[PDB]
Design a protein around this nucleic acid. Sequence first.
RNA 1: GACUUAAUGUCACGGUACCCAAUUUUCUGCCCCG
Lengths: 678, 1289
Amino acid sequence: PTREDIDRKEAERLLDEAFNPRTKPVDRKKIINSALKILIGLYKEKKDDLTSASFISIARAYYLVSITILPKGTTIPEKKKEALRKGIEFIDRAINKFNGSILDSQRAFRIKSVLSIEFNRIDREKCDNIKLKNLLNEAVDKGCTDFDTYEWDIQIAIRLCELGVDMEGHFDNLIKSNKANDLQKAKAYYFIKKDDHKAKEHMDKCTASLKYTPCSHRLWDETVGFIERLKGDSSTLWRDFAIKTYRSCRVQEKETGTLRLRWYWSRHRVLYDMAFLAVKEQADDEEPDVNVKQAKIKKLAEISDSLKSRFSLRLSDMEKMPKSDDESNHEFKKFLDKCVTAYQDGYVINAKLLELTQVPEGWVVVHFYLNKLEGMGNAIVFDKCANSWQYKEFQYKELFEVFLTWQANYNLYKENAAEHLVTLCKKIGETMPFLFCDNFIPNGKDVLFVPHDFLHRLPLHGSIENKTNGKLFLENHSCCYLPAWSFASEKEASTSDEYVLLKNFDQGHFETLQNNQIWGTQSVKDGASSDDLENIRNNPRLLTILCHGEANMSNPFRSMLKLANGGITYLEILNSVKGLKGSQVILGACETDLVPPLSDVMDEHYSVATALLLIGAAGVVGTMWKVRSNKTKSLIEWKLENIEYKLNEWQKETGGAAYKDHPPTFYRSIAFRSIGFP
Amino acid sequence: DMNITVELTFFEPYRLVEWFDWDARKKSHSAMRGQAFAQWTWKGKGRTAGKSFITGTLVRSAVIKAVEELLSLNNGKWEGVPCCNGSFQTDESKGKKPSFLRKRHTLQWQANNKNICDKEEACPFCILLGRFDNAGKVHERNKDYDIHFSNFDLDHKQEKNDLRLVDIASGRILNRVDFDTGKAKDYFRTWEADYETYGTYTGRITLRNEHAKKLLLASLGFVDKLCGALCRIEVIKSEDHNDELRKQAEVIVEAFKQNDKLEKIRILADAIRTLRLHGEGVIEKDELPDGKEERDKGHHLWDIKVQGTALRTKLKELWQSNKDIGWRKFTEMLGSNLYLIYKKETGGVSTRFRILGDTEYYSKAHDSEGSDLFIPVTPPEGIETKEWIIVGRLKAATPFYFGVQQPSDSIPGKEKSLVINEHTSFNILLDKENRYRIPRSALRGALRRDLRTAFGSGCNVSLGGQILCNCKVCIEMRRITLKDSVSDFSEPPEIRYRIAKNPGTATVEDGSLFDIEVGPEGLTFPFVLRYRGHKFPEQLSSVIRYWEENDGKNGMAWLGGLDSTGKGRFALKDIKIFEWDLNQKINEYIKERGMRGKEKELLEMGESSLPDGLIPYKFFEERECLFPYKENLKPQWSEVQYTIEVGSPLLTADTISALTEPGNRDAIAYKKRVYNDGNNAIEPEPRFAVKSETHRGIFRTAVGRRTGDLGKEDHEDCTCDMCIIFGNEHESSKIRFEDLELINGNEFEKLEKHIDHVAIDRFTGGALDKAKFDTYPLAGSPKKPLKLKGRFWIKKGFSGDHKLLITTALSDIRDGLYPLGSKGGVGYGWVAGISIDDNVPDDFKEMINKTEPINNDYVHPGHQSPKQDHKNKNIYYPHYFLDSGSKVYREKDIITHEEFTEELLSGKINCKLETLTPLIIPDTSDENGLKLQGNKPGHKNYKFFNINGELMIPGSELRGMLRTHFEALTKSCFAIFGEDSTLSWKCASKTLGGKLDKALHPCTGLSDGLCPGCHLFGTTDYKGRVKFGFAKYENGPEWLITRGNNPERSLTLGVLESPRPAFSIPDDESEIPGRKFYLHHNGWRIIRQKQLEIRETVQPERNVTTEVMDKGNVFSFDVRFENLREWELGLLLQSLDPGKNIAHKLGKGKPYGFGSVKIKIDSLHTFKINSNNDKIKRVPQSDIREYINKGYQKLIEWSGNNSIQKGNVLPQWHVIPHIDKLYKLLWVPFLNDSKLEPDVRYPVLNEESKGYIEGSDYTYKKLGDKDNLPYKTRVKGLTTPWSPWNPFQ
RNA sequence: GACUUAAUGUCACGGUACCCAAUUUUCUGCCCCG
Ligand SMILES: [Zn+2]
Ligand SMILES: [Zn+2]
Ligand SMILES: [Zn+2]
Ligand SMILES: [Zn+2]
């Protein structure tokens, strides 16, 4: 016993304390660093005279360093790859330093195999499948088959079964082992014995187990990867696996409170897309019963709404969140620590919501979904008077190109991009021809749109029919918008007769609006600090906020209305503002100042209108882009004269059907939008 | 069908990349990022030579972009011929994709040709694109091309053999910084090529149509940017020296390794680098420093033997063998080689551990799923397009720093490891002619940061992108063009040094030293900016007015890379804005090429000689009208200016200038170099300052001790208070510091003062040999103080408790707990005050303006022998020894300086000092003094100690006196003990370090504990907890007058010969008899009367003349203490004033009776700053009595005698034996108005000598041998105090 | 002429070598017997 063995045994004690599941992560990050300090000191002392055991301990410590680095953003960080590369380069020296015991050769090949499996999962072109297959066959030749004592042998066996080599000799020891979880048993049955009944049973137990684990776990990623492989192999079980995994994800996500959040993991969207495709392929099959087909189209709408509820903030934005409201800050910190603890534990060991059919009479509801997997777009219509469901499909590529063209031209030449606006409206009318036919959307009905991602920015109410003298959509129907179906509620509070105005900016002038006497309450003011917003108390019938806006391009909880002494953000609206039950709100800021511009097809970014809807306001009327101030003053005066009249009448009267002769008046009319469903 | 010969000239350094074909390009990352650069191909093998070229497709894309812009300016027309909007889309089903895909927007216009273009007749745009040609996308013969771009070869003027890559390019590392954290995310590498020698390329363009020829010749001049540099397109008709120095550096390091002195090599490295600031004569005239008092040692560093000769002769020989490469390259090469060998050999330097390294990242390709997006952009018809040019100069307001990788770590051929070994020496970015350089990347990143602050919102920059970002910052930044700047200055930079401080021991940590290279302040760089657009923004005007300095407002351009220590604050001077109208004056822009490269002529041009079309711009908005200003840019950083008033000498060491500059000085103050712009050189006089890192660390220690955060051993992933204010390895700091500059240093005469110090051996009483040292501080006095002006900056977003912390740190610097510089325990650098300028924000003003007898009565029973006779017939001996035996108590739980503990005490004592006998404290800088040495040559005469004509006593004298008293009281070890050579009387036994017991040796290290004296006053590994200040004269008479004397002051003393320890140890037994003390008597009367006798009859080389002070003078001084227990404070207050009839001894002439002083404790203040408020008490008489009682009980407990009772009575110190002997040695007989006064004098050596005065038998012949007294009774007579020596007892 | 480009499509002026670390702790310019 020299001091090399004493220091190695101390470092091994520290690593065995770090491999314990009862340890919090903030202690693990210190324990691993102490152990690596001792071992790298021994290496700097005895550079090539080191035994194989210290090299094995260094490789294990670098595996722990690799699993303690959390991904930020949507990219695997380079620190993870650097840790796995250094561990491989350290254990290769113990492999090439021969003349040890056979047990130490077994241990070295086991550590090299698990580091290579993780590095092949992260990076593909650096560590390909052929190299991994050769290394794993070499590791299983040395006798790494003890399925009762180590679970890393189970991982090696299942990964080799996935890569395609025969493993029929080890099946009985694989099944009878009590370290294996149920996904590994289902993979073993399907890939070796070709038995689908036992695979079906073990996968059902796996999903019922997934109902209680957080979404930061490894098991979610592995399960969705198995369903993707089953769909690629043209099996007949991925249809039934996808729906159960979707149900488990819904029940697990239900537990969070009113602050709508979910953990970002990369295979969420492919799970919802495969569930949508499974229910759609069941629905297009012919059946003599029609009620089953109605139930399947309703299931499609439910999957779409459950995707559109939350918005999935990233990790660095969650770590940089401001500290206030010591109970809600406590809820957020509890959520974050639960997610990080589940992420590491996977690697160390192994009001009411309305029904979809609850709509007032004479209404028609249209849901949207953009399927990235098949590259298509689905529109789902519900009709209340006939009580029927239908759905149609369309393409979305050239629509995206025309929208990006209008975005660039607007951001340079705001009022002179009007011809590109007219071209975008004609393109919406050409790609989606179903909303002008009488079978899909009936004549004279009120339409509620629940859009998906880049359809949140398109003007759907100003589409033009693909004819010679085309008509607009707002000439026959009255349109309303909603971010998701979960934001709808009831009890439209029409209590008071109060009128309130607030105003902070003095660029576009509103003095003729300011001098009116209808703003007779003492709550009205023209300085507009945030505490002036948090002191309204008696639920006014109309509130009018007139200020500028500012958008945070990562965190939607930091988008602010530019009021006095710092403004008021999304989170402060959700925590502080109370007296707005059943209040029509008219914003003065445009939508382009409150949301950032999009650079991808998918975007989830909710403005302050959704926070005003969650506080309890009955409807926000806003501008989608920057209009002259005279139009906003005209809208506010028309709303004061008539609070019970619909917006599309005013859009038809003041020049909304003038796209042929004067595109500026058409630009100024169709900018206005109502974001609240009764 | 005629050909065109084209030249391409650069005006900035361009980029270079290696040539791969198409598929080997996809195998590499740097080649895929490095498209649209200049390509490099090798020649032969060995990868050392090759050639550079620019492809024709790159020039074709540049000309196509220029033609599109020119056709968009005139709405689709050029000289009356119209044109369609081309074609930029390719179908995949018919033909392949053209090997380079477009992501940006394309400009379009309303097509008014009304004839569809075909092969028969086509517009100029379709000819220049080459649609209706032959030879599409698979190459054939060079005919059947309507337009052809050939490759562009380097026009080398010495194309004789080959070009090396190291002779054209230079490697560099760029960066990407997060906006919130201030830290970098990733990095990447480029090759930058020289433009002064290798910047002309020559090619050939073939055209077969005139209809395109007019537009092509127009659009070759509109190209402004190629390969990363501004360009202009015209149409015409020593490794062997490194190897030798590396071998010699290995020889030097091996010699230093053999002499067991390796750690000096690091110091030596930077010493040689500092030699580039001097001439070569310092190695040829031997102007290096020498040992001031050497017999064998020589210098501390320049006289180490290397292969049988000294180091200075070795350096002279190495310079005599390498005269061809110059002096500067010689010094830099030898310093770099020494540092690299030291870093190789040291290896594990036990600093920050740093696993896992750092990350490169190049932007990933678009191989999956594609994007065939085509985005047309149409400007409106009556729009106006203009181009603005801003010219000016950039002036450094502080030192600056632009980082660079180490040379021999960035070689463009062969770039450069399981463990991580980070460097500790950093360099600055220079050009090839050794000129300073502000790179384009630093300016562009700073402009992006300030524009994101001014807009209020911006994105983080994404790299792998298919759609361009449409945030406002990116839209405005796609129109700004800058230009790299170089100075007209080539002098070498300065090296600035930094250490770390261990917070428990308050000493320096080993291996924590690092250094940077900084450039001078006052330098000027050129500055050009160009903006091409439709209207000039308000946010760019706000950033320009923020960077610009005027009267009152100073500049705020934080470029560079060490901003937390205040490095890289520039200002913008002499701005001029000019305007091009491109819709009417496009031909003059083409003719003058946009003044590219001629921007230096625009700064000196009058308004009359401007080119046609360029007008001055006069609608430039003022500072108090811009709304991005006053709301986002002005409240960002807030300034606090103040002035420190220091009333003590100030010493902040340099430690390299003491080894380079001549004068053999040990510790000298810190200086700077300042560039002036009236003339064009550095200023001849240098400027004294205290560095920014020093008072940054002062504020950090002051905050961390009150919050209690310095005790934590780890600071990664932390969110404590001092990691929020001062930052860590993950976040940048919120507080930025600048230097403290001396402002009143012109009303002094002889600003630097020489102060010399020595250590006194405890046994022999004289100076320990070869421990003399010197200091040269700045002369601070209590009536002429130093005034230092300083400044720091606070960021917006600070809470109330953090501002309370910073104001409490400022109040603690004002109160005097943190002295500046070195040697604070002996009184150097004590703050007397802080003044705050009236531009400071009002919250700091109110928060700083809101935080605004003892007698002992113990009388000692003196010795009976000088009290019974009272006729003065006895003669005593002047020095006696004290002997407590061997037991010393060593505590191993040492009190730390990490925090202010609650149970302990801290405060200050004000004391007054009164003289009972005359006092001599000499000013031993001036050896000639006051009396002329022309007459009686060799006669040393001195003056009293004075700083600026004010009589003072140094703090080191007071500290040594009280330390010797405390060590004799508390039974501590010998702190300063000379283990000298073998004592004689034949050669006797082992040396006198071996005569001493092992327990009384000095404390070395913190493992075996610390004695009470070393625990209170300090050691080499532990800072003390008491600080003694300088004493100022305040009252009383002065200048003891004597009649017949050339000054009326200035007594001439007797001889003072070295002490001989063979009188106390006169055999091989009879060990070291303890410490040595002197008695209190009036021998100065017999010196003063016999002046004429000793001015004659002695040799005047053995004598010393010095000024004296009379009895009755009052001095005043202060003692400051932190983290003390109750018994330590009690024993300290007892050791200051030990009662009536007890007094101390101080100064020169202690055997003759000079210098008996008495200290009275005037006041005692305490504070407990971890309470609710930082208060100050007064500590009345009862509490100090209880403290002294606690100290007395601790002393009884150490003695062990449990017979003495405990009670609330006054202590009697004479019940302990050694306290009784010590207080017998310090008893004054003439104070209680008794008529008796003793006679104290040495024997006079075998009479028939000079002073005998009677037949007294008081010679060393009779007191010497073992016949009148044996040896043991001599040691017994030396050991018992106040015993008579005539007659003997 | 090759080394050395492919042509109806190159935002690399698309990326600050950046972030943390008091040149200092200890020492009376002092002293009588061969
Ligand atoms: Zn054409
Ligand atoms: Zn951007
Ligand atoms: Zn901390
Ligand atoms: Zn000691």
